[PDB]
Design a protein around this ligand. Structure first.
Ligand SMILES: Nc1nc2c(ncn2[C@@H]2O[C@H](COP(=O)(O)OP(=O)(O)OP(=O)(O)O)[C@@H](O)[C@H]2O)c(=O)[nH]1
Length: 317
């Protein structure tokens, strides 16, 4: 059988009970995905890109090349993976740390089970108060490697495979498709970004290359933008007086980086925002025991300083 364990994910006030696939069953699915996606990176990872924050330096690049833009859905990143394990057709969703859950839909076409790797976001539809799975892109469709084709081709492949799929009310996530809008259509982007934020929780915008193949991992040419200056970091309290630290993952030592005004419990993780020269407390995170790492800190500082906005960026076009 596939060894399961149950688990519940909470997003936006709503929760989904999923079977987390465990042990050797998890390991087989992962290995299957690694094969299908032809990924020979020695460290386990989803076959899809992780964005970089836009910087002022990239504005040139965007002006020379072709790019699409979309809302940055706030949810959990999942690679959706159709396959067969032990002869059985299995629809998995796998997260960035390579945690597998089954997510079953009644009417998935059997072609999909020849091997389909789609990328997306499990998220909540605000209007409907149900979960949605929003597809960004496809890497392999019905055994056919689509990743080296350009974006429209991949969507053409993905949308073809699902042409006959209909979601039934008892399915756990409504499947939906990211509507990608060309960066040279600002009025079409804004409207799309207005209508999108009626259905979903977003965290800005994603800007993606119209034609490059799929990148697995950090994609220096996939840019995210956070609306305005509202970036945060998690520090660890290194002293009861609020010396905040940031984690150096290769020292595995927390480095003293600032101080907060207040009394704090040493060892706690505080989410802080920058304002007027200092970090300010926003919320304590009882769910974390680790601060963010130096690179996220060094990068977030640059972002705060650059203060790119959605309106600057949308005005460039
Ligand atoms: N690649 C991609 N990611 C998208 C898209 N829409 C939303 N996202 C999400 O945006 C994330 C971007 O990475 P980050 O900016 O680090 O966001 P995060 O993983 O929520 O982490 P924090 O920023 O620490 O909250 C992706 O991992 C996706 O989960 C999209 O079209 N493409």
């Amino acid at each position: 059988n596939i060894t399961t364990e149950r688990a519940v994910l909470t997003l936006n006030g709503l929760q989904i009970k999923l079977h987390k696939v465990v042990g050797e069953s998890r390991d087989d699915i992962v290995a299957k995905m690694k094969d299908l996606a032809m990924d020979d990176h020695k460290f386990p990872r989803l076959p899809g890109p992780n964005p970089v924050s836009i910087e002022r330096k990239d504005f040139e690049k965007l002006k020379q090349n072709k790019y699409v833009v979309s809302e940055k859905t706030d949810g959990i990143r999942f690679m959706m993976f159709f396959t067969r394990v032990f002869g059985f057709k299995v629809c998995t969703i796998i997260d960035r740390a390579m945690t597998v859950y089954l997510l079953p839909f009644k009417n998935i076409p059997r072609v999909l089970f020849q091997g389909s790797i789609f990328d997306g976001e499990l998220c909540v539809d605000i209007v409907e108060k149900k979960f949605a799975f929003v597809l960004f892109d496809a890497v392999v469709v019905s055994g056919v490697t689509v990743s080296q084709m350009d974006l429209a081709s991949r969507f053409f492949a993905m949308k073809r495979s699902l042409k006959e799929f209909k979601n039934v009310p008892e399915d756990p996530a409504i499947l939906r498709y990211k509507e990608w809008i060309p960066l040279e259509h600002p009025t079409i982007i804004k409207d799309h970004l207005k209508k999108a934020n009626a259905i979903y929780h977003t965290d800005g915008l994603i800007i993606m290359s119209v034609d490059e193949p799929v990148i697995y991992g950090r994609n220096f040419n996939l840019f995210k933008l956070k609306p305005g200056t509202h970036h945060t970091i998690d520090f660890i309290i290194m002293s009861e007086d609020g010396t905040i630290g940031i984690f150096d993952p290769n020292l595995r030592k927390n480095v003293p980086v600032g101080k907060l005004d207040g009394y704090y419990n040493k060892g706690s993780i505080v989410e802080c925002g920058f304002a007027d020269g200092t970090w300010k407390y926003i919320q304590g995170r009882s769910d974390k025991n680790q601060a963010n790492d130096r690179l996220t800190y060094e990068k977030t500082l640059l972002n705060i300083e650059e203060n790119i906005t959605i309106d600057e960026l949308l005005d460039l076009f």
